[PDB]
Design a protein around this ligand. Structure first.
Ligand SMILES: *[C@@H]1O[C@H](CO)[C@H](O)[C@H](O[C@@H]2O[C@H](CO)[C@@H](O[C@@H]3O[C@H](CS(=O)(=O)O)[C@H](O)[C@H](O[C@H]4O[C@H](CO[C@H]5O[C@H](CO)[C@@H](O)[C@H](O)[C@@H]5O)[C@@H](O)[C@H](O[C@H]5O[C@H](CO)[C@@H](O)[C@H](O)[C@@H]5O)[C@@H]4O)[C@H]3O[C@@H]3O[C@H]([C@H](O)CO)[C@H](O)[C@H](O)[C@H]3O)[C@H](O)[C@H]2O)[C@H]1O
Ligand SMILES: *[C@@H]1O[C@H](CO)[C@H](O)[C@H](O[C@@H]2O[C@H](CO)[C@@H](O[C@@H]3O[C@H](CS(=O)(=O)O)[C@H](O)[C@H](O[C@H]4O[C@H](CO[C@H]5O[C@H](CO)[C@@H](O)[C@H](O)[C@@H]5O)[C@@H](O)[C@H](O[C@H]5O[C@H](CO)[C@@H](O)[C@H](O)[C@@H]5O)[C@@H]4O)[C@H]3O[C@@H]3O[C@H]([C@H](O)CO)[C@H](O)[C@H](O)[C@H]3O)[C@H](O)[C@H]2O)[C@H]1O
Lengths: 68, 68
Protein backbone atom coordinates (compact mmCIF):
# COMPACT_ATOMS: atom_id res chain seq x y z
CA UNK A 1 0.00 0.00 0.00
CA UNK A 2 2.19 2.88 1.32
CA UNK A 3 4.77 3.31 -1.60
CA UNK A 4 1.92 4.09 -4.05
CA UNK A 5 0.26 6.59 -1.66
CA UNK A 6 3.62 8.33 -1.08
CA UNK A 7 3.96 8.61 -4.90
CA UNK A 8 0.51 10.27 -5.24
CA UNK A 9 1.48 12.87 -2.57
CA UNK A 10 4.76 13.69 -4.42
CA UNK A 11 2.85 14.30 -7.70
CA UNK A 12 0.50 16.73 -5.89
CA UNK A 13 3.54 18.64 -4.46
CA UNK A 14 5.26 18.70 -7.90
CA UNK A 15 2.34 20.54 -9.57
CA UNK A 16 2.40 23.35 -6.95
CA UNK A 17 6.16 23.87 -7.45
CA UNK A 18 5.72 24.07 -11.25
CA UNK A 19 2.83 26.57 -10.80
CA UNK A 20 5.09 28.61 -8.46
CA UNK A 21 7.98 28.65 -11.00
CA UNK A 22 5.63 29.95 -13.76
CA UNK A 23 4.86 33.05 -11.63
CA UNK A 24 8.59 33.70 -11.04
CA UNK A 25 9.30 33.68 -14.81
CA UNK A 26 6.57 36.30 -15.46
CA UNK A 27 8.84 38.96 -13.87
CA UNK A 28 11.42 38.53 -16.70
CA UNK A 29 9.24 38.08 -19.82
CA UNK A 30 7.90 41.67 -20.12
CA UNK A 31 8.94 45.29 -20.84
CA UNK A 32 11.65 44.56 -23.48
CA UNK A 33 11.26 46.50 -26.76
CA UNK A 34 13.21 48.38 -29.46
CA UNK A 35 13.29 52.01 -28.20
CA UNK A 36 16.31 53.33 -30.18
CA UNK A 37 15.76 56.47 -32.34
CA UNK A 38 18.29 58.78 -34.07
CA UNK A 39 17.78 62.11 -35.85
CA UNK A 40 19.73 64.82 -37.66
CA UNK A 41 18.56 67.96 -35.81
CA UNK A 42 19.82 71.56 -35.95
CA UNK A 43 18.72 74.47 -33.75
CA UNK A 44 19.04 78.24 -33.18
CA UNK A 45 18.12 80.14 -29.98
CA UNK A 46 17.02 83.80 -29.58
CA UNK A 47 15.55 86.02 -26.81
CA UNK A 48 11.99 85.07 -28.01
CA UNK A 49 12.14 81.81 -30.02
CA UNK A 50 13.85 78.45 -30.37
CA UNK A 51 13.97 77.16 -33.97
CA UNK A 52 14.30 73.40 -34.58
CA UNK A 53 14.87 71.97 -38.03
CA UNK A 54 15.01 68.22 -38.76
CA UNK A 55 17.08 66.84 -41.68
CA UNK A 56 16.56 63.05 -41.24
CA UNK A 57 15.33 60.45 -38.69
CA UNK A 58 15.62 56.68 -38.10
CA UNK A 59 11.80 56.38 -38.14
CA UNK A 60 8.71 58.59 -38.69
CA UNK A 61 7.13 59.46 -35.30
CA UNK A 62 4.30 61.69 -34.02
CA UNK A 63 5.27 65.15 -32.69
CA UNK A 64 2.95 64.39 -29.70
CA UNK A 65 5.16 61.39 -28.69
CA UNK A 66 8.23 63.64 -28.13
CA UNK A 67 8.76 65.45 -24.80
CA UNK A 68 10.80 68.69 -24.57
CA UNK B 1 21.35 36.09 -30.51
CA UNK B 2 22.56 39.50 -29.18
CA UNK B 3 25.70 40.15 -31.44
CA UNK B 4 23.49 40.03 -34.58
CA UNK B 5 20.85 42.38 -33.07
CA UNK B 6 23.59 44.84 -32.02
CA UNK B 7 24.86 44.75 -35.65
CA UNK B 8 21.38 45.61 -37.04
CA UNK B 9 21.15 48.63 -34.67
CA UNK B 10 24.60 49.90 -35.82
CA UNK B 11 23.53 49.73 -39.50
CA UNK B 12 20.41 51.81 -38.71
CA UNK B 13 22.59 54.45 -36.93
CA UNK B 14 25.11 54.49 -39.84
CA UNK B 15 22.45 55.48 -42.42
CA UNK B 16 21.33 58.52 -40.34
CA UNK B 17 24.95 59.75 -40.02
CA UNK B 18 25.47 59.43 -43.81
CA UNK B 19 22.19 61.31 -44.44
CA UNK B 20 23.37 64.03 -42.00
CA UNK B 21 26.76 64.37 -43.78
CA UNK B 22 25.01 64.85 -47.18
CA UNK B 23 23.20 67.93 -45.80
CA UNK B 24 26.48 69.41 -44.49
CA UNK B 25 28.13 69.11 -47.94
CA UNK B 26 25.24 71.01 -49.61
CA UNK B 27 26.54 74.25 -47.99
CA UNK B 28 29.79 74.05 -50.05
CA UNK B 29 28.59 72.81 -53.47
CA UNK B 30 26.77 75.99 -54.64
CA UNK B 31 27.32 79.63 -55.67
CA UNK B 32 30.70 79.20 -57.46
CA UNK B 33 30.84 80.63 -61.01
CA UNK B 34 33.06 82.56 -63.45
CA UNK B 35 32.17 86.25 -62.80
CA UNK B 36 35.33 87.93 -64.23
CA UNK B 37 34.82 90.63 -66.92
CA UNK B 38 37.27 93.21 -68.37
CA UNK B 39 36.65 96.14 -70.72
CA UNK B 40 38.50 98.98 -72.44
CA UNK B 41 36.38 101.99 -71.43
CA UNK B 42 36.99 105.74 -71.85
CA UNK B 43 34.88 108.58 -70.46
CA UNK B 44 34.38 112.38 -70.44
CA UNK B 45 32.36 114.40 -67.88
CA UNK B 46 30.58 117.76 -68.33
CA UNK B 47 28.09 119.93 -66.36
CA UNK B 48 25.17 118.14 -68.17
CA UNK B 49 26.39 114.77 -69.55
CA UNK B 50 28.69 111.82 -68.96
CA UNK B 51 29.95 110.19 -72.18
CA UNK B 52 31.08 106.54 -72.09
CA UNK B 53 32.75 104.88 -75.06
CA UNK B 54 33.71 101.18 -75.13
CA UNK B 55 36.67 99.94 -77.24
CA UNK B 56 36.71 96.20 -76.33
CA UNK B 57 35.34 93.71 -73.75
CA UNK B 58 36.12 90.17 -72.52
CA UNK B 59 32.55 89.08 -73.39
CA UNK B 60 29.38 90.52 -74.98
CA UNK B 61 26.85 91.42 -72.22
CA UNK B 62 23.44 93.14 -71.99
CA UNK B 63 23.42 96.85 -71.05
CA UNK B 64 20.59 95.98 -68.58
CA UNK B 65 22.96 93.63 -66.64
CA UNK B 66 25.34 96.51 -65.74
CA UNK B 67 24.68 98.75 -62.72
CA UNK B 68 26.00 102.35 -62.55
C1 LIG C 1 -2.66 44.97 -28.63
O1 LIG C 1 -2.93 44.78 -30.01
C2 LIG C 1 -3.60 45.87 -30.64
C3 LIG C 1 -3.87 45.46 -32.08
O2 LIG C 1 -2.64 45.30 -32.79
C4 LIG C 1 -2.78 47.15 -30.50
O3 LIG C 1 -1.55 47.10 -31.24
C5 LIG C 1 -2.44 47.37 -29.04
O4 LIG C 1 -1.64 48.55 -28.93
C6 LIG C 1 -2.47 49.61 -28.45
O5 LIG C 1 -3.44 50.02 -29.42
C7 LIG C 1 -4.31 51.07 -29.00
C8 LIG C 1 -5.30 51.29 -30.12
O6 LIG C 1 -4.63 51.55 -31.36
C9 LIG C 1 -3.47 52.31 -28.67
O7 LIG C 1 -4.32 53.34 -28.19
C10 LIG C 1 -4.06 54.50 -28.96
O8 LIG C 1 -3.08 55.29 -28.29
C11 LIG C 1 -2.74 56.44 -29.06
C12 LIG C 1 -1.59 57.19 -28.42
S1 LIG C 1 -0.35 57.30 -29.52
O9 LIG C 1 0.77 58.06 -28.93
O10 LIG C 1 -0.84 58.02 -30.73
O11 LIG C 1 0.12 55.94 -29.88
C13 LIG C 1 -3.98 57.33 -29.19
O12 LIG C 1 -4.39 57.78 -27.89
C14 LIG C 1 -5.12 56.56 -29.85
O13 LIG C 1 -6.30 57.36 -29.82
C15 LIG C 1 -6.73 57.77 -31.11
O14 LIG C 1 -8.10 58.01 -30.82
C16 LIG C 1 -8.34 59.11 -29.93
C17 LIG C 1 -9.84 59.18 -29.70
O15 LIG C 1 -10.45 59.06 -30.98
C18 LIG C 1 -11.62 58.21 -30.88
O16 LIG C 1 -12.78 58.99 -30.57
C19 LIG C 1 -13.11 59.97 -31.56
C20 LIG C 1 -14.27 60.79 -31.03
O17 LIG C 1 -13.79 61.61 -29.96
C21 LIG C 1 -13.41 59.29 -32.89
O18 LIG C 1 -13.68 60.27 -33.90
C22 LIG C 1 -12.22 58.43 -33.33
O19 LIG C 1 -12.56 57.73 -34.53
C23 LIG C 1 -11.79 57.46 -32.22
O20 LIG C 1 -12.81 56.46 -32.12
C24 LIG C 1 -7.76 60.40 -30.50
O21 LIG C 1 -7.95 61.47 -29.59
C25 LIG C 1 -6.27 60.21 -30.75
O22 LIG C 1 -5.70 61.40 -31.31
C26 LIG C 1 -4.42 61.66 -30.71
O23 LIG C 1 -4.12 60.72 -29.66
C27 LIG C 1 -2.87 60.89 -28.96
C28 LIG C 1 -3.11 61.64 -27.65
O24 LIG C 1 -3.98 60.83 -26.83
C29 LIG C 1 -1.82 61.56 -29.84
O25 LIG C 1 -0.51 61.19 -29.40
C30 LIG C 1 -2.02 61.13 -31.29
O26 LIG C 1 -0.93 61.57 -32.10
C31 LIG C 1 -3.35 61.67 -31.81
O27 LIG C 1 -3.11 63.00 -32.30
C32 LIG C 1 -6.02 59.02 -31.67
O28 LIG C 1 -6.54 59.34 -32.96
C33 LIG C 1 -5.37 55.27 -29.09
O29 LIG C 1 -6.33 54.48 -29.79
C34 LIG C 1 -7.49 54.13 -29.01
O30 LIG C 1 -8.69 54.62 -29.61
C35 LIG C 1 -9.86 54.13 -28.93
C36 LIG C 1 -11.10 54.46 -29.75
O31 LIG C 1 -12.24 53.91 -29.09
C37 LIG C 1 -11.00 53.87 -31.15
O32 LIG C 1 -10.83 52.45 -31.07
C38 LIG C 1 -9.94 54.72 -27.52
O33 LIG C 1 -11.02 55.64 -27.45
C39 LIG C 1 -8.63 55.43 -27.16
O34 LIG C 1 -8.58 56.68 -27.86
C40 LIG C 1 -7.42 54.59 -27.54
O35 LIG C 1 -7.33 53.45 -26.69
C41 LIG C 1 -2.42 51.97 -27.62
O36 LIG C 1 -1.56 53.09 -27.41
C42 LIG C 1 -1.58 50.78 -28.04
O37 LIG C 1 -0.76 50.35 -26.96
C43 LIG C 1 -1.75 46.17 -28.42
O38 LIG C 1 -1.58 46.44 -27.04
C1 LIG D 1 18.34 76.08 -65.71
O1 LIG D 1 18.48 75.68 -67.07
C2 LIG D 1 17.81 76.53 -68.01
C3 LIG D 1 18.01 75.92 -69.40
O2 LIG D 1 19.40 75.92 -69.76
C4 LIG D 1 18.34 77.96 -67.89
O3 LIG D 1 19.70 78.08 -68.31
C5 LIG D 1 18.25 78.41 -66.44
O4 LIG D 1 18.78 79.73 -66.35
C6 LIG D 1 17.67 80.64 -66.25
O5 LIG D 1 16.93 80.72 -67.47
C7 LIG D 1 15.81 81.62 -67.42
C8 LIG D 1 15.11 81.50 -68.76
O6 LIG D 1 16.03 81.75 -69.84
C9 LIG D 1 16.31 83.02 -67.12
O7 LIG D 1 15.20 83.91 -67.02
C10 LIG D 1 15.44 85.00 -67.88
O8 LIG D 1 16.08 86.05 -67.14
C11 LIG D 1 16.39 87.15 -67.98
C12 LIG D 1 17.20 88.19 -67.22
S1 LIG D 1 18.64 88.43 -68.01
O9 LIG D 1 19.42 89.47 -67.30
O10 LIG D 1 18.36 88.89 -69.39
O11 LIG D 1 19.41 87.16 -68.03
C13 LIG D 1 15.10 87.75 -68.53
O12 LIG D 1 14.29 88.24 -67.45
C14 LIG D 1 14.31 86.69 -69.30
O13 LIG D 1 13.04 87.23 -69.67
C15 LIG D 1 12.89 87.40 -71.08
O14 LIG D 1 11.48 87.38 -71.15
C16 LIG D 1 10.82 88.49 -70.52
C17 LIG D 1 9.33 88.28 -70.65
O15 LIG D 1 9.10 87.89 -72.00
C18 LIG D 1 8.11 86.84 -72.05
O16 LIG D 1 6.79 87.40 -72.13
C19 LIG D 1 6.56 88.17 -73.31
C20 LIG D 1 5.18 88.79 -73.20
O17 LIG D 1 5.23 89.81 -72.20
C21 LIG D 1 6.73 87.30 -74.56
O18 LIG D 1 6.56 88.08 -75.74
C22 LIG D 1 8.12 86.66 -74.57
O19 LIG D 1 8.23 85.77 -75.68
C23 LIG D 1 8.41 85.92 -73.25
O20 LIG D 1 7.58 84.76 -73.22
C24 LIG D 1 11.31 89.80 -71.14
O21 LIG D 1 10.70 90.90 -70.48
C25 LIG D 1 12.82 89.90 -71.01
O22 LIG D 1 13.29 91.11 -71.61
C26 LIG D 1 14.31 91.70 -70.78
O23 LIG D 1 14.50 90.96 -69.55
C27 LIG D 1 15.48 91.46 -68.62
C28 LIG D 1 14.78 92.28 -67.54
O24 LIG D 1 13.89 91.41 -66.82
C29 LIG D 1 16.59 92.23 -69.33
O25 LIG D 1 17.78 92.18 -68.55
C30 LIG D 1 16.84 91.60 -70.70
O26 LIG D 1 18.01 92.17 -71.30
C31 LIG D 1 15.61 91.80 -71.60
O27 LIG D 1 15.73 93.08 -72.22
C32 LIG D 1 13.49 88.68 -71.65
O28 LIG D 1 13.27 88.75 -73.05
C33 LIG D 1 14.10 85.46 -68.42
O29 LIG D 1 13.50 84.42 -69.20
C34 LIG D 1 12.26 83.93 -68.66
O30 LIG D 1 11.18 84.09 -69.58
C35 LIG D 1 9.99 83.45 -69.12
C36 LIG D 1 8.96 83.42 -70.25
O31 LIG D 1 7.80 82.73 -69.79
C37 LIG D 1 9.51 82.72 -71.47
O32 LIG D 1 9.89 81.38 -71.13
C38 LIG D 1 9.45 84.17 -67.88
O33 LIG D 1 8.24 84.85 -68.21
C39 LIG D 1 10.47 85.17 -67.35
O34 LIG D 1 10.50 86.31 -68.21
C40 LIG D 1 11.87 84.56 -67.30
O35 LIG D 1 11.94 83.56 -66.29
C41 LIG D 1 17.09 83.03 -65.81
O36 LIG D 1 17.67 84.32 -65.59
C42 LIG D 1 18.21 82.00 -65.83
O37 LIG D 1 18.79 81.88 -64.53
C43 LIG D 1 18.95 77.45 -65.51
O38 LIG D 1 18.72 77.90 -64.18
Amino acid sequence: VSPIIATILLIAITVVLAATLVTILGGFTHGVSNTVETAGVTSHITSKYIFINVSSSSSAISASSITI
